[PDB]
Write a protein that binds this DNA or RNA. Structure first.
Ligand SMILES: Nc1ncnc2c1ncn2[C@@H]1O[C@@H]2COP(=O)(O)O[C@H]2[C@H]1O
Ligand SMILES: Nc1ncnc2c1ncn2[C@@H]1O[C@@H]2COP(=O)(O)O[C@H]2[C@H]1O
Ligand SMILES: Nc1ncnc2c1ncn2[C@@H]1O[C@@H]2COP(=O)(O)O[C@H]2[C@H]1O
Ligand SMILES: Nc1ncnc2c1ncn2[C@@H]1O[C@@H]2COP(=O)(O)O[C@H]2[C@H]1O
Lengths: 200, 200
DNA sequence: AAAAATGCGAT
DNA sequence: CTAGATCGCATTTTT
DNA sequence: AAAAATGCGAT
DNA sequence: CTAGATCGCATTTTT
């Protein structure tokens, strides 16, 4: 790709070890991010410390872009590295320049903001409509289709803690587990610890 | 404002009577909207017909913008008119042109997309964290602060059906009502039918 | 050992 | 009435 | 009347 | 155990 190559050339690159945190919530926003390599997680916490995963982002994804359109804006959430991470970085001020040079880039950002709004809205519906069993059953299906799923003679094999399934669908580790036994109880899946084979 | 005036001049205007529907969900997307006057509601329905209000939009708000960045895109939700409505309209194709003429407009769109993502994410958290009492108590507070709230010697007076409070916080008309009696039972509010005075 | 992540029944 | 959450108790895991 | 919107207890 | 939803029944509302 010609454009984004021109873009990066204008960004410093930084790497973050997995589990580290790239964007702090509440903190003043002035920089834009573009994940060159690695995946992360965007999450918001409750007063008590409880977390809720709003999304995962990957290669070719921008981050910290929500405060780019109105001075004195704060980070809307925490962004933690899921894996090692190589991330390009540029200042809004700097970035805004590029925009005026070539608009095509702002068009790339906006598209991601668009797709982002769809899925988050889809997420509002899920919490509003489906029950936790439904929400988990859907997450396993989705995860079983991502690139990090391994092949298995009976379907797909994923590996994830129950804590996270709780932090994705919005329930508690305790409910996830109970639900997980049922789904197996119904030969729908097979779980052993963090390993789950989604049959199909 | 100089820009948006240049914009409208390029859009046909259409009016929609209240309760009518401007954007059909699922339908192919090719047009952009900008509410010149009136307010609307963006909503998604469940398989059974049940509705969930993702948001309300007003004067100076764009609509149907999510399918503007990738050919063959479908409307992500229903958009129904809350009041009479005067709405400017333009085709993506046409709109994209303007972008290349002046980028500033795409910058206005994107900002709204940004703000939109914040609040929807804030909404995901609400459904995940707070209970229905908490979610309703917050809606009444918010609504009591909008421009259509009327002054009252004991606080603010809003007027809304319980069906809607159910469609905003994600509960059922029956739970809203029960919750509403409690909040009054606690001299927090005072409700008579569709009328509610939020004390304070 | 370290450092977390459970598990399931019970209320 | 049923789906979830929070505790009570007993055991198992990645850094 | 039209046309919806409830209300609350009960399970 | 508690918050919600779904039904059972009886009455009240904006077009
Ligand atoms: N309303 C909620 N109730 C319980 N857990 C929640 C809620 N919203 C988000 N969560 C989080 O999701 C997590 C799932 O696993 P845990 O039980 O370890 O901890 C849970 C909380 O941190
Ligand atoms: N719902 C969401 N979906 C995807 N990414 C999000 C969401 N909410 C926040 N983010 C990202 O997380 C970032 C947190 O800081 P910013 O608000 O600067 O920008 C935010 C977005 O890049
Ligand atoms: N999971 C849900 N359970 C119940 N009602 C819901 C849900 N999600 C959205 N709703 C809608 O919210 C509305 C609130 O008022 P009603 O009971 O008239 O009808 C309800 C449904 O149409
Ligand atoms: N969560 C949301 N918040 C605000 N507006 C939304 C949301 N989801 C959808 N919309 C608007 O509703 C429109 C429905 O059709 P489009 O997908 O073309 O574009 C969508 C947005 O303009």
């Amino acid at each position: 790709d010609p454009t984004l190559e021109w873009f990066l050339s204008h960004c410093h690159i930084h790497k973050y070890p997995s589990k580290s945190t790239l964007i702090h919530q509440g903190e003043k926003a002035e920089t834009l991010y573009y994940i060159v390599k690695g995946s992360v997680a965007v999450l918001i916490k409750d007063e008590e410390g409880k977390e809720m995963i709003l999304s995962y982002l990957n290669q070719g994804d921008f981050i910290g872009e929500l405060g780019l359109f109105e001075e004195g804006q704060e980070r809307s959430a925490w962004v933690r590295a899921k894996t090692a991470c190589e991330v390009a970085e540029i200042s809004y001020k700097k970035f805004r320049q590029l925009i005026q040079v070539n608009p095509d880039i702002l068009m790339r950002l906006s598209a991601q903001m668009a797709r982002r709004l769809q899925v988050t809205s889809e997420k509002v519906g899920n919490l509003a409509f489906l029950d936790v069993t439904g929400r988990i059953a859907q997450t396993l299906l989705n995860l079983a289709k991502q690139p990090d799923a391994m092949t298995h003679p009976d379907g797909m094999q994923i590996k994830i803690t129950r804590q996270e399934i709780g932090q994705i669908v919005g329930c508690s580790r305790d409910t996830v587990g109970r639900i997980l036994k049922m789904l197996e109880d119904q030969n729908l899946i097979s779980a052993h610890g963090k390993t789950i084979v989604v049959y199909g």
